């Protein structure tokens, strides 16, 4: 028996929806859900979504609390809907998907993914739940994650990191690295080779390789010498050029991280969502150098070096395409006399 008051009961007593019976008094004012605790109202939930406040409250309560793929991964794989769960998008404070399957009466399109209305949609299946590797088998379109091998299917090994209650982390007490599988029109796909973004914070940035350690601890000239990077324009692309009104380059998160230790800057996240490439309007506080659209990606520096060192440097400009987080990321590569001028995620 689904009810606003029982959803609130679960939130209050179990920290999320947990199928427990019970009711607490609830009041809804504008976009906020309150409950009464000893005669005073206590806020349980502020609706930041475009859904009705009580609907969004229920979907948030029923969010998946196990490590799940980051939304950018799901989006890049074309996932339209999840099977019997809600992937909560913590970057948008909203459900990652419009509709649900067997979750909520206001948003459900079906109780089970085997219903035909689900056949065209790419359904997310979680092999850690009994019976869902088998539902993927009968599913026309879908994406499946597992922790171990699936007899009859070659896996695509995903990123090391997953999202646990909006914290992106590499699990040590839980597994966050999944096998990925995908089916389009009943056919198991071969997922492409792909790099993975590292999903790190500017504030909490930690190197994950000796080259990244070398990048953070060495001066610019030393690092470029040690990894034989003359002519690839890391001065511009990675370190950043702060001498002109328009900030130069600075497209790799580790380069922002290094700069942030020395002097601060504003990153305006004008499309706040999870995505492989992030666009920021950045203002450098020390110099006043700024750029309206500064595309930023968090690649392992190692991976970025391999990408730029695997390009032909003999044309003035061209589009370079790189599979990242399973999607095709277009870069612009600009060269002159056989050296790199700039190289950036294309602003398209």
Ligand X SMILES: O=C(NCCN1CCCC1=O)Nc1ccccc1
CA distances from 159 to 63, 240, 329 (A): 21, 28, 17
Q: Write out the binding residues.
A: 291-295, 342-346
Q: Which residues are annotated as a binding site for uracil?
A: 291-295, 342-346
Separation CA 90–CA 88 (nearest Å): 6
Among the residue ranges 138-146, 171-179, 210-218, 336-344, the one whose residues contact its own copies (CB under 8 A):
171-179
Q: Which is nearer to its own copies, 36 or 309 (CB)?
A: 36
Which range, of 44-52, 136-144, 207-215, 336-344, touches its own copies by CB under 8 A? 44-52
With H, G, I as helix, E, B as strand and everything else as coil, classify residue 204: coil
- Burial of 312: CB neighbours in 10 Å, binned 0-12, 13-18, 19+: exposed
Distance in Å, CB of 185 to ligand X, minimum? 8
Cα separation, 299 vs 252, in Å, equals 7
Host H or E run for residue 348? none
Question: CB of 346: closest distance to ligand X in angstroms?
Answer: 35
Tell me how far apart the alpha carbons of residues 55 and 200 are, in angstroms, rounded to a whole number: 32
Q: Which of 62, 72, 97, 236 is catalytic?
A: 236
Q: Is 80 in the site for its own copies (CB under 8 A)?
A: yes
d(CA 81, CA 159): 21
Q: Which is nearer to ligand X, 179 or 197 (CB)?
A: 179
Q: Check 62, 72, 258, 291 and give the catalytic one.
A: 291
What span, in angstroms and rounded, lies between the C-alpha atoms of 43 and 89?
21
Find out whether 246 and 291 touch, Cβ atoms under 8 Å. Answer: yes
Site size toward its own copies (CB under 8 A) is 92
Instruction: Tell whether residue 146 is a contact of its own copies (CB under 8 A).
Output: no
| Nearer CB in complex with its own copies: 100/156 | 100
- Choose, from 72, 182, 183, 251, the residue flagged as catalytic: 251
Residue ranges binding ligand X (CB under 6 A): 133, 136-137, 150, 152-153, 183, 186, 188
For residue 291, indicate whether it is catalytic. yes
281 is a site residue for its own copies (CB under 8 A)? yes
- What values do phi and psi take at 290, rounded to 5? -150, 165
Nearest distance from C-beta of residue 19 to its own copies, angstroms? 13
Question: Would you state the structure tokens that stand for residue 135, as one six-digit string?
Answer: 């539902």
Catalytic residues: 236, 251, 291
């Amino acid at each position: 028996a689904m009810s606003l008051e029982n959803v609130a009961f679960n939130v209050v007593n179990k920290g999320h929806f947990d199928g427990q019976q019970g009711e607490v008094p609830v009041s809804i004012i504008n976009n906020t859900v309150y409950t009464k605790v000893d005669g005073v109202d206590v806020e349980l939930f502020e609706n930041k979504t475009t859904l009705p406040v009580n609907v969004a409250f229920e979907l948030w309560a029923k969010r998946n609390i196990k490590p799940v793929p980051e939304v950018k991964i799901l989006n890049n794989l074309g996932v339209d809907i999840a099977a019997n769960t809600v992937i909560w998008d913590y970057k948008r404070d909203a459900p990652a998907h419009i509709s649900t399957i067997g979750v909520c009466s206001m948003t459900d399109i079906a109780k089970k993914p085997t219903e035909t209305i689900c056949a065209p949609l790419t359904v997310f299946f979680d092999g850690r739940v009994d019976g869902q590797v088998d539902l993927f088998r009968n599913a026309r379109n879908g994406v499946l994650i597992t922790e171990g091998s699936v007899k009859g299917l070659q896996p695509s090994v995903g990123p090391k990191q997953a999202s646990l209650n909006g914290v992106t982390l590499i699990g040590e007490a839980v597994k966050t690295q999944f096998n990925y599988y995908k089916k389009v029109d009943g056919v198991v796909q071969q997922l492409p080779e792909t790099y993975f973004t590292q999903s790190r914070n500017l504030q909490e940035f930690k190197p994950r390789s000796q080259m990244e350690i070398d990048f953070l601890e060495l001066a610019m000239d030393e690092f470029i010498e040690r990894y034989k990077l003359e002519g690839y324009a890391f001065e511009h692309i990675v370190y950043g050029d702060f001498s002109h009104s328009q900030l130069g380059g600075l497209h790799l998160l580790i380069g922002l991280a290094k700069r942030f230790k020395e002097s601060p800057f504003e990153l305006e996240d004008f499309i706040p969502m999870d995505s492989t490439v992030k666009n920021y309007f950045i203002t450098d506080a020390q110099t006043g150098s700024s750029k309206c659209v500064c595309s930023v990606i968090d690649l392992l520096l190692d991976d970025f070096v391999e990408i730029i060192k695997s390009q032909d440097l003999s044309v003035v400009s061209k589009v370079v395409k790189v599979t990242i987080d399973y999607t095709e990321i277009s870069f612009m590569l600009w060269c002159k006399d056989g050296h790199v001028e700039t190289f950036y995620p294309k602003l398209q």
